[PDB]
Scaffold this active site. Structure first.
Site, PDB file in Angstrom:
ATOM      1  N   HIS A   1       0.839  -1.200   0.000  1.00 55.56           N
ATOM      2  CA  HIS A   1       0.000   0.000   0.000  1.00 55.56           C
ATOM      3  C   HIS A   1       0.878   1.257   0.000  1.00 55.56           C
ATOM      4  O   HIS A   1       0.553   2.254  -0.648  1.00 55.56           O
ATOM      5  CB  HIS A   1      -0.921   0.003   1.228  1.00 55.56           C
ATOM      6  CG  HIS A   1      -0.188  -0.120   2.527  1.00 55.56           C
ATOM      7  ND1 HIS A   1      -0.382   0.751   3.578  1.00 55.56           N
ATOM      8  CD2 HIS A   1       0.772  -0.987   2.932  1.00 55.56           C
ATOM      9  CE1 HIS A   1       0.430   0.430   4.570  1.00 55.56           C
ATOM     10  NE2 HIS A   1       1.142  -0.620   4.204  1.00 55.56           N
TER      11      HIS A   1
HETATM   12  C1  LIG Z   1       4.162  -6.287   4.574  1.00 57.59           C
HETATM   13  C2  LIG Z   1       2.995  -5.368   5.037  1.00 57.59           C
HETATM   14  C3  LIG Z   1       3.223  -4.449   6.143  1.00 57.59           C
HETATM   15  C4  LIG Z   1       2.217  -3.572   6.655  1.00 57.59           C
HETATM   16  N1  LIG Z   1       2.520  -2.701   7.749  1.00 57.59           N
HETATM   17  C5  LIG Z   1       1.468  -1.842   8.223  1.00 57.59           C
HETATM   18  C6  LIG Z   1       1.782  -1.027   9.308  1.00 57.59           C
HETATM   19  O1  LIG Z   1       2.927  -0.971   9.902  1.00 57.59           O
HETATM   20  N2  LIG Z   1       0.683  -0.204   9.765  1.00 57.59           N
HETATM   21  C7  LIG Z   1      -0.599  -0.171   9.194  1.00 57.59           C
HETATM   22  O2  LIG Z   1      -1.489   0.585   9.668  1.00 57.59           O
HETATM   23  N3  LIG Z   1      -0.875  -0.984   8.102  1.00 57.59           N
HETATM   24  C8  LIG Z   1       0.148  -1.811   7.646  1.00 57.59           C
HETATM   25  N4  LIG Z   1      -0.147  -2.663   6.570  1.00 57.59           N
HETATM   26  C9  LIG Z   1      -1.452  -2.660   5.979  1.00 57.59           C
HETATM   27  C10 LIG Z   1      -2.530  -3.392   6.692  1.00 57.59           C
HETATM   28  O3  LIG Z   1      -2.122  -4.832   6.774  1.00 57.59           O
HETATM   29  C11 LIG Z   1      -3.812  -3.321   5.949  1.00 57.59           C
HETATM   30  O4  LIG Z   1      -4.479  -2.055   6.132  1.00 57.59           O
HETATM   31  C12 LIG Z   1      -4.837  -4.428   6.330  1.00 57.59           C
HETATM   32  O5  LIG Z   1      -6.011  -4.261   5.466  1.00 57.59           O
HETATM   33  C13 LIG Z   1      -5.314  -4.395   7.761  1.00 57.59           C
HETATM   34  O6  LIG Z   1      -4.429  -5.142   8.610  1.00 57.59           O
HETATM   35  P1  LIG Z   1      -4.877  -5.668  10.029  1.00 57.59           P
HETATM   36  O7  LIG Z   1      -3.715  -6.373  10.582  1.00 57.59           O
HETATM   37  O8  LIG Z   1      -5.406  -4.504  10.828  1.00 57.59           O
HETATM   38  O9  LIG Z   1      -6.196  -6.554   9.735  1.00 57.59           O
HETATM   39  P2  LIG Z   1      -6.540  -7.883   8.975  1.00 57.59           P
HETATM   40  O10 LIG Z   1      -7.700  -8.515   9.721  1.00 57.59           O
HETATM   41  O11 LIG Z   1      -5.263  -8.698   8.809  1.00 57.59           O
HETATM   42  O12 LIG Z   1      -7.131  -7.401   7.522  1.00 57.59           O
HETATM   43  C14 LIG Z   1      -6.356  -7.393   6.286  1.00 57.59           C
HETATM   44  C15 LIG Z   1      -6.610  -8.638   5.445  1.00 57.59           C
HETATM   45  O13 LIG Z   1      -7.144  -9.674   6.262  1.00 57.59           O
HETATM   46  C16 LIG Z   1      -7.984 -10.488   5.488  1.00 57.59           C
HETATM   47  N5  LIG Z   1      -8.759 -11.315   6.469  1.00 57.59           N
HETATM   48  C17 LIG Z   1      -9.401 -10.964   7.735  1.00 57.59           C
HETATM   49  N6  LIG Z   1     -10.004 -11.966   8.336  1.00 57.59           N
HETATM   50  C18 LIG Z   1      -9.785 -13.087   7.471  1.00 57.59           C
HETATM   51  C19 LIG Z   1     -10.176 -14.483   7.509  1.00 57.59           C
HETATM   52  N7  LIG Z   1     -10.882 -15.008   8.524  1.00 57.59           N
HETATM   53  N8  LIG Z   1      -9.789 -15.325   6.422  1.00 57.59           N
HETATM   54  C20 LIG Z   1      -9.071 -14.842   5.362  1.00 57.59           C
HETATM   55  N9  LIG Z   1      -8.630 -13.490   5.243  1.00 57.59           N
HETATM   56  C21 LIG Z   1      -9.082 -12.700   6.397  1.00 57.59           C
HETATM   57  C22 LIG Z   1      -8.705  -9.445   4.639  1.00 57.59           C
HETATM   58  O14 LIG Z   1      -9.450 -10.041   3.615  1.00 57.59           O
HETATM   59  C23 LIG Z   1      -7.636  -8.454   4.313  1.00 57.59           C
HETATM   60  O15 LIG Z   1      -6.911  -8.694   3.111  1.00 57.59           O
HETATM   61  C24 LIG Z   1       0.858  -3.619   5.986  1.00 57.59           C
HETATM   62  C25 LIG Z   1       0.629  -4.540   4.882  1.00 57.59           C
HETATM   63  C26 LIG Z   1       1.651  -5.384   4.417  1.00 57.59           C
HETATM   64  C27 LIG Z   1       1.265  -6.291   3.267  1.00 57.59           C
END
Ligand SMILES: Cc1cc2nc3c(=O)[nH]c(=O)nc-3n(C[C@H](O)[C@H](O)[C@H](O)COP(=O)(O)OP(=O)(O)OC[C@H]3O[C@@H](n4cnc5c(N)ncnc54)[C@H](O)[C@@H]3O)c2cc1C
Ligand SMILES: Cc1cc2nc3c(=O)[nH]c(=O)nc-3n(C[C@H](O)[C@H](O)[C@H](O)COP(=O)(O)OP(=O)(O)OC[C@H]3O[C@@H](n4cnc5c(N)ncnc54)[C@H](O)[C@@H]3O)c2cc1C
Ligand SMILES: Cc1cc2nc3c(=O)[nH]c(=O)nc-3n(C[C@H](O)[C@H](O)[C@H](O)COP(=O)(O)OP(=O)(O)OC[C@H]3O[C@@H](n4cnc5c(N)ncnc54)[C@H](O)[C@@H]3O)c2cc1C
Ligand SMILES: Cc1cc2nc3c(=O)[nH]c(=O)nc-3n(C[C@H](O)[C@H](O)[C@H](O)COP(=O)(O)OP(=O)(O)OC[C@H]3O[C@@H](n4cnc5c(N)ncnc54)[C@H](O)[C@@H]3O)c2cc1C
Ligand SMILES: Cc1cc2nc3c(=O)[nH]c(=O)nc-3n(C[C@H](O)[C@H](O)[C@H](O)COP(=O)(O)OP(=O)(O)OC[C@H]3O[C@@H](n4cnc5c(N)ncnc54)[C@H](O)[C@@H]3O)c2cc1C
Ligand SMILES: Cc1cc2nc3c(=O)[nH]c(=O)nc-3n(C[C@H](O)[C@H](O)[C@H](O)COP(=O)(O)OP(=O)(O)OC[C@H]3O[C@@H](n4cnc5c(N)ncnc54)[C@H](O)[C@@H]3O)c2cc1C
Ligand SMILES: Cc1cc2nc3c(=O)[nH]c(=O)nc-3n(C[C@H](O)[C@H](O)[C@H](O)COP(=O)(O)OP(=O)(O)OC[C@H]3O[C@@H](n4cnc5c(N)ncnc54)[C@H](O)[C@@H]3O)c2cc1C
Ligand SMILES: Cc1cc2nc3c(=O)[nH]c(=O)nc-3n(C[C@H](O)[C@H](O)[C@H](O)COP(=O)(O)OP(=O)(O)OC[C@H]3O[C@@H](n4cnc5c(N)ncnc54)[C@H](O)[C@@H]3O)c2cc1C
Ligand SMILES: Cc1cc2nc3c(=O)[nH]c(=O)nc-3n(C[C@H](O)[C@H](O)[C@H](O)COP(=O)(O)OP(=O)(O)OC[C@H]3O[C@@H](n4cnc5c(N)ncnc54)[C@H](O)[C@@H]3O)c2cc1C
EC number: 4.1.1.-
Lengths: 171, 171, 171, 171, 171, 171, 171, 171, 171
Positions: free
Chosen positions: H73
C-alpha cells in the site's frame, strides 16, 4: 533392570516391514519404563499409521508435526532419558554416522544429551555392503551402540533380548 | 558383448538437463539387453515425466510409487543383473559414497547384489570440488565403477562408449 | 571493507529459530554490498516466509522454485561473488561436509566457484556432538570457512562481527 | 489338511486393533493354500494400509476399489473356495446375520457360493451383549461357522489353531 | 390401469448393473403416471450418473443432496403416491426388512405413508442365501410387496410386466 | 436424583431437526451430573456443527474423529456411567436392535457396560411403521430403555421429564 | 398486528450463540407475515448452517452467494418490506452506525428503502462499552430502531415481545 | 490539462456493476497521463477479472496479491501522484471516512501522500441514506474530493467529465 | 512493576513488518508477567506464522481458530488482565475507535473488561492522516491508552520503554 522403571524412553521407528510389528516391543517395554513415546520417519508412517502406533504408547511424534507445526527435536531429545531407534534403516545409519539430519529421527540423535542405541534391520544384500559396515563402525567409534540383527528362519532380537540390550547400554 | 543380450538392465536417472536426452541411451541399449527398466529421482521426473521415459523402455519406477505404494528397492535391486545410474548427480554420488539413501535410486544401490556403475554429470564448478572427487574415490574403493564425463564443445560419453563401459564393468 | 561495495552476496538461510531475526543481518549488510539475495531451505521458510524475507533483500530463492520451476543452483552459484550460509544447521554442515545436496542451499555450495563461509547455530547438545566437530573440521580441510557461534545470556555473532568475518574470508 | 494346498483362500479383515497383526496369520497360511487374497473394510484400512497388507498376500481388495472402480463381490466371492473373515467385528456379525451388506466384506458373504467362517474379536463388554450372541446363533442357524475367541493374558486363536478351524469347516 | 395416470411415482434405484438400463422402465412408465421422480443410492450413481437418469424422468434425488443439503425423506416419501424400488439389492432388502436406514432409499421406505413395492435383482448365489429369503418374507409379513425376479437367457420382468405389478399392488 | 451429581453422562445425538435444540437438554442437565459429553452421527453434525454443540457440554466426539483418528467406542463407552441417545432415529433403533454398528453412536451402545436409554424422535409416518415398533420392542426385550415421544401442537419430552426418565432408568 | 400478514419480512442473522435458537423466532413469526426470508453473516453460518436455517423459513441468503454468485443487496433490500436484524452483533452495530458494509447483512441495511430494526445481543462486558452505546445512539439518531436486550437468569426478548416490537416499529 | 501527461495515475475499482465498463474510462485516460495502474477490491474482481482489466492499463494490483504476496500500500500509495477511486462503494466511503482499512483500496487511501478523489456509485436507496451523506461530508472535511454521481435514463459522469474533475482536483 | 508478576498479559499482533520482531518484546516481557498469550490478525500471520510466534509465548490465538473452531473473544478477553495491542495498525485503530470488530483482535477489545493499551505503528504518510489522529483521540476519550510511536534512524519504543508504558497504564 528395575532402574529403568523411572526413565523416559523414546523409540524412533524407521522404514521397514518389521515396523508393522512394533507393538510387540512397545507393549513389552510398557511395564519396565516410566513412560514411552515414539518418533517416526515418513516411510514408517506409510507402513503403519502414527494413529495406529499411538494405541501402543503414550505419544507419537510425526515428521509432519501436529497441526502443521514441526515437533521439537531438542524438546523430545531432552525429554527422553533413553533414545532407541528400532528398527533402524541403512539410511538412518548413514545419516547419523555422518552428521546429516534430514528427518526428525536423525535430528533427534544430535539433540539427545546421551548416545543413541540402534537396532538395524535391512535386506541381507544391504547388510553386507561395505558402507553399512563402515557406517556402523563409525557410529560405535562416535559412542553410539548398535545392536546387531540376528539370522532367522536377518531380523531384530525378540523384545526381551532388546530390553536387556537397552538396560546394558544405559551405563 | 553378446553376453548382455540375456541380462536385465536397470537404469537410474537423476536430476540433470542431460536426462532429457536419456532416450538416446535407452533406445541404443534396447538391442543389447534382455530387458531394460528405469528408476528415477524426483528432480529427474520434473525435467522429463516418467510417462515420457516409459515410451523408451519396459517400465519406469517412480519415487512416488505406483498407486501410492512405494516400489520395492530389494525387488528392483534383485530383479536387475546390472544397475547403472546415468546421469548421476553430485548428490547421488555423495549419498551412495556415504551409505545414505533418501530416495529409491540411492536405496537401490544398497539393495542390488552387485556393484553399481555410475555415469556422473554436473557443472564443471561442481566437478572440481574436493568432496566430489573424494566421494568418487570412496565409491571406487568400495567397489563401484565411475565412468568419468568427457569435455566437449563436460558431458556423458555417447551411447556406444557407455555401452562398452557397461560391458567392461560386467566382469 | 569498501571492496565489498561492488560484490554480489548470497545468503543461504537454514532451519533455526534465529532465522526469524535474519533482517538484522540483512539490513545491516545492505549498505556494504552491491546487491544481496537469499536462498532458503524448507524449514527456514516454515519459520519465516520467503515473502517476509523479501522485504529485507533483493530476491529470495525458494526450494519450491518460483512458478513450479526449481531455481538454478549454477545460476545462483555463479551469480554470487560471496556465498554465506547463516544460520547453518548441523544438517547443512553434515550435507556439505560429505558432498550430499538434497536441497538448493547445499547444492549451491557445490555450484559456487569459490568456497562458502558458514555461520553454524544449533542447540548446545548438538554442538558438542562428535560428528558435528568432525564435519566442521572436514569443511575447513576442504577450504570452507566456519565462523564459530558465541556463548551468550550459544548464538551468532552480531551483524557487525559477521560482516567483518565475511570481509576477512573474502581473501 | 493337504487338501487345502490347492484351494483359493479369501480373508476379509474388519476394524480391530488385532488386524495390525494379520501378517502372522497371513504368512502362516501361505504354505497351506494355493493362493491367498484379502478384502478389507474401511476401518481395517485406517488401522493398517491395504498396501502394507499386500506385502503378506497375493492381492488386497479395498472398499475404495482400485482406480475408482469398486471391486466385484461376485468375482471375489466366486474366485475364492474358502472365505474366512478374521477378525470379524460385532458390526460385520450384525450385518451378515441380518442380510445387510453396506461394505464389500459383508456383500461378499452373500456372493460366496459356500458358507463363511467367522473369527469374531471385540471388547468383552461387547462380547457379552445379548444381540451379539443372538447374531452369532443366527449365523450358525444359517449355516455359517463362528470360531469363538479365547480369553488371554479375549482374542483370536493362534494361526495354527485357526488353520485347523479352517480345515475342519471345509467339510 | 388408467387410475395411475393421476398418481405420483417415486422410483428408488439401487446398486446393480441392471440400473444402467433403467431408462427402459422409466420411459415406458412416463405415459401411465402423472409424474415420475427418482431417488438413488451411492452405488447406483457410480454406475449411472444422476444427471444421466434425469434425462428420463422429472427429477432425481441424490444421496449427496443438491447443493450440499440432504433431500427430505418425509418430503419425497409424502410427495409420492407410489414408491417402487427397482432394482432392489440384497442390502436394501436387508436394511428395510430390519428397520435400518443408512441411505435415503431405505429411509424413504419408512417415511412413505403406504407400503413399498420391491423389485429385487442380484446374483443367483446371493438370491439363494437363507437371509435374503428370510428378509423377503419379513418384508411381506410387514406389508411390503416383493416382485420376484425371473430366470433368463435371473433378472427383472420387462417394463410392461413391472407396470402391471405396480397397478396390482396399488390396491 | 442427587445420586446423578457424581455420574458421567454421555449423550449420543442422531440426525433429526430436533437436534438443533439439543442445548436445552444439555444446559439443563449440566447441574445434575458430574460431567456431560456428546457423541454425534454424521447427519446430526450436518444439522448442527460439533463445534456448536461444544459450547453446551464438556466434549464432543465426532464420527470423523479428532485429527483423523477415530474416537474410541470402548473408551467413551467405559468413560460414561450413563449413555443416553437423544434424539434417536429409526435408523439408530434399527441398528442397535439388530447388533449392527456402522457409526460411533451405535458402536458405543455395544461397548457401554450398562444398557442404553433411547429417546426416539421421527416422523409420525415412520413412527407407525411395523419394523420400528418391532425394533423398539426388541431393544426392550434386550434390556434397553425406550422413552416414547409425546404428541404435541410427536416430539421429545421436555428436559425436566427427560431428566426424570434418566434417573428412573439408572436403577 | 394483522397488518403484517401481508408483508415480506427479512431477518438478518449475525454471529452469536443465540443464533442457534433462531427457529423459535422464525417459526413464531411464520403465521404473522406473508413470507419470511433470512440473510446471514459468515459467523452465523459457522454456528448454524444456512441449510439448517432453511427448514424454518422460505429462503436463506448466504454471504457465500448461491452457485458462486453473490446475492443482491438491492434485490433483497427491496424485496423485503421489513428488515429486522436478530441477533445483531456489536460489529454489525458498529458497521451500520458508520456506513460501513463489509458483508451482505450490513450492505442490505443501506439498500433497504426503510429503516432497520436491530435486536442487539452480546456479552455484558461488550454491552457496557462506550462505543457500543455511542453506536446504538447514532443508529437511533439516523432513524433505525434498536430493541434493547433484557437481563435474565442479558438476552433477546421472547419471540412474542419481539413480534410486538416489530409491529410497533412498522409505523 | 497537459500537466497530467507526466503524472502517475492509480485507479481503485470497487464492487459495482458499473465496474464492468471501467475500460471506457481507462482507455480514455491513457492519452492524458504518463502511466495508469489499477488496484481492485475482491467484489470488483468477481465482477470483472483483474486479468481482463489488465488489457486496459499498465498493471493491476489485486487484493489477493501476486504470487501469494500482498501488494504494498505504501509502494502503490507513493508510486501514484494521483489516486482516484472509481467507482467507489458506500462501503469504501464508510471505511475511508472513518479510518478503517480492511482491503488494499482503503489502505492505499491512508498511504497515499495526497488526498484521494472519489467517484461514488450506488443504488439510489443507498445514496439517500443519512450515513452515506455524513460519510461524504466527513471525507470532504478531511480533505478528500467526492465527485457526485449524476441522474440518468444515478451514475458516473462520462470519461471526459471525470477527466476534468481529476484535473481540477489536482490543485 | 513487581505487581505485574502475577497478571495475565494478552498481546494482539496486527499487520506490520515490525511484527516480525515481536519476539524481542515477547521474550523481554516473559519475566515480568505471570503468563503471556498472543492473538493475531490474518495479515500478521502471513508475515510471521502463528507457530513461529508460539516459540516465544504460552499460546497463540489465530483468527482461523484451532481445529476450525473460532477462538472465544469473551474467553480470551476475560482470561487476560491486561490487553495490549502491539503493533497496532491504522485499520485496528479505526475499527476499535468506531466499535467495529471484523477480526478477533478488534472483537477482543470490546470483550475485555478493562481498557486496552495500543502501540500504533504505520507509515509516516499514514500517521499524518487526519482520520488516524481523530481515531487516536476518540480512543483516548473512550478510555483506551495509545502509546505514540517514536521517530528513528517512526517506530515502536524499545521493549523496556513499552514495559514501563504497560505498568503505568495498569492504574
Ligand atoms: C508487509 C505489510 C506491512 C504492513 N505494515 C502496516 C503497518 O505498519 N501499519 C498499518 O497501519 N498498516 C500496515 N499494513 C497494511 C494493513 O495490513 C492493511 O491495512 C490491512 O487491510 C489491515 O491489517 P490488520 O492487521 O489490521 O487486519 P486484517 O484482519 O489482517 O485485515 C487485512 C486482510 O485480512 C484479510 N482477512 C481478515 N479476516 C480473514 C479471515 N478469517 N480469512 C481470510 N482473510 C481474512 C482481509 O481479507 C484483508 O486482506 C501492511 C501490509 C503489508 C502487506
Ligand atoms: C515396504 C518397505 C520396506 C523397507 N524396509 C527397509 C528395511 O528393513 N531397511 C532399510 O535400510 N531400508 C528399508 N526400506 C527402504 C527405505 O525406506 C529407504 O531407503 C528410504 O529412502 C529411507 O527410509 P527412512 O525410514 O530411513 O527415511 P525417510 O525419512 O522415511 O525417507 C524416505 C522417504 O521419505 C520421504 N520424506 C522425508 N521427509 C518427508 C516429508 N516431510 N514429507 C514428505 N515425504 C518426506 C522422502 O521423500 C523419501 O521418499 C524399505 C522400503 C519400503 C517401501
Ligand atoms: C534443471 C536442473 C538441472 C540440474 N543438473 C544437475 C546436474 O547435471 N548434476 C548435479 O549434480 N546436480 C544437478 N542439479 C541439481 C540437483 O537436482 C540437486 O542437487 C538435487 O538436490 C538433487 O538431485 P537428485 O536427482 O540427486 O535427487 P532428488 O531426490 O531429486 O532431490 C532433489 C529434490 O527432490 C525432492 N524430493 C525427494 N524425494 C521426494 C518425494 N518423495 N516427494 C517430493 N519431493 C521429493 C527434494 O525435496 C529436493 O528438492 C540440477 C537441478 C536442476 C533444477
Ligand atoms: C523451530 C525449529 C528450530 C530449529 N533450529 C535448529 C538449529 O538452530 N540448528 C540445527 O542444526 N537444527 C535446527 N532445527 C532442526 C533442523 O530443522 C532439522 O535437522 C532439519 O531436518 C534440517 O533443516 P535444514 O534447514 O538443514 O534442511 P531442510 O531442507 O529444511 O530439511 C528439513 C525438512 O525439509 C523437508 N523438505 C526438504 N525439501 C523439501 C521439499 N522440496 N518439499 C517439501 N519438504 C521438503 C524435509 O522433508 C524435512 O522435514 C530446528 C527445527 C525446528 C522445527
Ligand atoms: C482402533 C479401533 C479398534 C476397534 N476394534 C474393534 C473390535 O475389535 N471389534 C468390534 O466389533 N469393533 C471394533 N471397533 C469398532 C468398529 O470399527 C466400528 O463398530 C465400525 O463402525 C464398524 O467396523 P467395520 O470394520 O465392521 O466396518 P466399516 O465398514 O469399516 O464401518 C465403520 C466406518 O466405515 C466408514 N465407511 C464404510 N464404507 C466407507 C466408504 N466407502 N468411504 C468412506 N468411509 C466408509 C463408516 O462411515 C464408518 O465410520 C474398533 C474401532 C477402532 C477405531
Ligand atoms: C457393478 C456392481 C453391480 C452390483 N449389482 C448388485 C446387484 O444386482 N444386487 C445386489 O444385491 N448387490 C449388487 N452389488 C453390490 C451392492 O452394491 C453392495 O452390497 C453395496 O454395499 C450396497 O448397495 P446399495 O445400492 O444397496 O447401497 P449403497 O448405499 O450404495 O452402499 C454401498 C456403498 O455406498 C457407500 N455410501 C453410502 N452412502 C454414502 C455417502 N453419503 N457418501 C459416500 N459413500 C456412501 C458405502 O460406503 C458403500 O461402499 C453390485 C456392486 C457393483 C460394484
Ligand atoms: C433435516 C433432516 C432431519 C431428519 N430427522 C429424522 C428424524 O427426526 N428421525 C429419523 O428417524 N430420521 C430422520 N432423518 C433421516 C435420517 O437422518 C436418515 O435415516 C439417516 O440415513 C440416518 O441418520 P443417523 O443419524 O441415524 O445416521 P448417520 O450415521 O448420520 O447416517 C446417515 C448418513 O451418514 C453418512 N455417513 C455415516 N458415517 C459417515 C462417515 N464416516 N463419513 C461420511 N458420511 C458418513 C451416510 O453416508 C448417510 O448419508 C432426517 C434427515 C434430514 C436430512
Ligand atoms: C461462538 C461465538 C459467539 C459470538 N457471539 C457474539 C455475540 O453474541 N455478540 C457480538 O457482538 N459478537 C459475538 N461474537 C463475535 C463476533 O462473531 C465477531 O466480532 C465477528 O468478528 C463479527 O461477527 P459478525 O456476525 O458481525 O460478522 P462476520 O461478517 O461474520 O465477521 C466475522 C468473520 O467473518 C469472516 N468473513 C466475512 N465475510 C467472509 C467471506 N466472504 N468469506 C470468508 N470469511 C468471511 C471474517 O474474516 C471474520 O472472521 C461471537 C463469536 C463466536 C465465535
Ligand atoms: C453485482 C453487485 C453490484 C454492486 N454494486 C454496488 C454499488 O454500485 N455501490 C455500492 O455501494 N455497493 C455495491 N454492491 C455491494 C458491495 O459490493 C458490498 O457492500 C460489499 O460488501 C463491499 O464492496 P467493496 O467493493 O467496497 O469491498 P470488498 O472488499 O469487495 O468487500 C465485500 C466482500 O469482499 C470479501 N473480501 C475482502 N477481502 C477479501 C479477501 N482477501 N479474500 C476473500 N474475500 C475478501 C468480503 O468477505 C465481502 O464479501 C454490489 C454487490 C454486487 C454483488
Amino acid at each position: 533392570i528395575s532402574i529403568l522403571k523411572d526413565k523416559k524412553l523414546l523409540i524412533g521407528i524407521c522404514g521397514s516391514i518389521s515396523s508393522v510389528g512394533i507393538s510387540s516391543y512397545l507393549l513389552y517395554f510398557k511395564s519396565f519404563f516410566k513412560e514411552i513415546r515414539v518418533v517416526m520417519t515418513k516411510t514408517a508412517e506409510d507402513l503403519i499409521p502414527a494413529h495406529t502406533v499411538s494405541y501402543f504408547c503414550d505419544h507419537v511424534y510425526s515428521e509432519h508435526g501436529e497441526n502443521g507445526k514441526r515437533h521439537s527435536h531438542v524438546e523430545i531429545g531432552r525429554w527422553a532419558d533413553i533414545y532407541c531407534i528400532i528398527p533402524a534403516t541403512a539410511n538412518i545409519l548413514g545419516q547419523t554416522a555422518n552428521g546429516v539430519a534430514m528427518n526428525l529421527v536423525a535430528t533427534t540423535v544430535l539433540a539427545h544429551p546421551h548416545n543413541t542405541i540402534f537396532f538395524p534391520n535391512m535386506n541381507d544384500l544391504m547388510w553386507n555392503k561395505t558402507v553399512v559396515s563402515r557406517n556402523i563402525e563409525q557410529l560405535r567409534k562416535d559412542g553410539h551402540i548398535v545392536i546387531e540383527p540376528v539370522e532367522i528362519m536377518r531380523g531384530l532380537i525378540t523384545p526381551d533380548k532388546a530390553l536387556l540390550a537397552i538396560e546394558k547400554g544405559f551405563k
